[PDB]
Write a protein that binds this ligand. Sequence first.
Ligand SMILES: Nc1ncnc2c1ncn2[C@@H]1O[C@H](COP(=O)(O)OP(=O)(O)O)[C@@H](O)[C@H]1O
Ligand SMILES: [Mn+2]
Lengths: 5, 325, 281
Amino acid sequence: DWIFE
Amino acid sequence: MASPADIVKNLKESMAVLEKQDISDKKAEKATEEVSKNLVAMKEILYGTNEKEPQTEAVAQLAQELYNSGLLSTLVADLQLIDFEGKKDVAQIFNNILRRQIGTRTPTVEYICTQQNILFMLLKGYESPEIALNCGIMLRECIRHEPLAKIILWSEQFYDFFRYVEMSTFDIASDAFATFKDLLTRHKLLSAEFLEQHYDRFFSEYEKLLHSENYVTKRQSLKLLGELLLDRHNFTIMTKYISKPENLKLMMNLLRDKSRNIQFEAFHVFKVFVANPNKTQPILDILLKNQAKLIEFLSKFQNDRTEDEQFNDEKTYLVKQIRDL
Amino acid sequence: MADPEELFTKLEKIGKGSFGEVFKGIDNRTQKVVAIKIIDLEEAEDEIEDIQQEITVLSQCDSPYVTKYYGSYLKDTKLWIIMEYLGGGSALDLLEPGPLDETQIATILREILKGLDYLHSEKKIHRDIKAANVLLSEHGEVKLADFGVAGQLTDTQIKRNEFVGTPFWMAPEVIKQSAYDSKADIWSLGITAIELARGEPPHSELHPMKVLFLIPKNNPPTLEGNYSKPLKEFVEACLNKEPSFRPTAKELLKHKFILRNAKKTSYLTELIDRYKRWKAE
Ligand SMILES: Nc1ncnc2c1ncn2[C@@H]1O[C@H](COP(=O)(O)OP(=O)(O)O)[C@@H](O)[C@H]1O
Ligand SMILES: [Mn+2]
């Protein structure tokens, strides 16, 4: 999954 | 017989019966039959079976007596008490005369401008199931004309739409959304202005839609957003939108959503954060940080959509950009 | 909100076509038998508001010649169109054991022309007229269904410029994507009459892509066989390559053929037994 953050 | 505006006097009188207390025998039922016949009588003044509508003794005497009698309000204010085919006919009448031009003037738009409460009664109609869909038809015709569009849009009562597109009843909630889409997209300049000025509280409210439990609400709201940002008239609204990291982060999560149709719509919003020449500081911070995981994402994203040209060109445009910082 | 699966109990899959599937079912809250149509909005992608238009059109009608609409519910991605249940099956179902006499044919076409009249008078087109879409009730009442692809005609945008219907039943102008109105529905009725007679339409054996070149170039089709001249020149009223020269739904009700024999309904309850036996055979 995305880098948030 | 065939009268000209004794029809207006009849309607007005019968509606008066239908709105008083009890009498639920003989007279209640005989008043309901009278409203039916006259809405028909009236409906065929304007359309007129196998004989043209008389651009004189028809429309004007009828249009004139509709304004002077305030019958147009009484029918919207009491739309409830009328019967099924009745409400269908009322709405068709209302639409016909609101379209009526004499010269370059639309007399009804002028009348409503001074009887503004008619628009507010229609809008408020969404909260009464028996009439919600009729009021939608009529309201949406009003909206066709900018003065009235303006009246509703700039009113505080427009933010009631964020409840209406969210009802319980799917038919009604969907219709609410139709009107609410019509407002924000038809009179481009009008709505570009509204969005520029009300930005903060509008989009704070629009964001709740993008998180809906209702699938249709979410998918359609998201689809619309993309239309609004990508519009030419809304340049300024767009720039502000694509400067906020919270916005990018939402889109990117919507790229990875349970629904592939919602991911698809998220794409057309996400699309413009990247195509944007003048990016801001935490924009790049998230893109470059999530570079490559994105270039990998984009390639393996909705490839089964080859009946679609642009989409596949935009994907190859986006990976080109996320590999070019 | 409002969970259908709680306040409706779905029973036997009653059909399954284009959009989704239909189920028999019960309204737990009232104990009415309803038909339930369920469309997966996620798979669908006709459009989406274009989908919701089958509800809009259907929900505005209030006729005994059109399937009543009761409501719609949303459950995750599946949309439940709840509508009035009809037992006796399609006209096409009923034609399956074997042919039908000119009384049956006429009374059916009578019942359909009522409805075709309800629709057109308030400026609505069905556009998908065929024996398949004409459902019957257990009482043998005849009602219009699907649409599906029913258009609305406003006071502006009178004619229509779209691309719908099923290929054998389409009216020359619809295939050519020219301008058309309710007269297209009258064409399709013509071919429905032939279907009710010869059990199948003009060029049943041909390929879809053929008959889309055929229908516009060629002459109108005719009732060929042992069938009374009242109808041969009835269908010829409808099947006329020129729209405006096609009758209205109103006068076709006056036409000689309907009136021999315009026997009342319920006298078709034969056909449904006739079909109920043929099926279990
Ligand atoms: N109200 C109903 N009562 C009984 N059967 C129905 C009803 N609605 C649909 N059906 C069944 O479903 C079949 C196809 O439905 P239709 O509305 O044409 O769906 P589609 O557009 O997917 O073809 C009909 O031929 C009929 O057999
Ligand atoms: Mn069908």
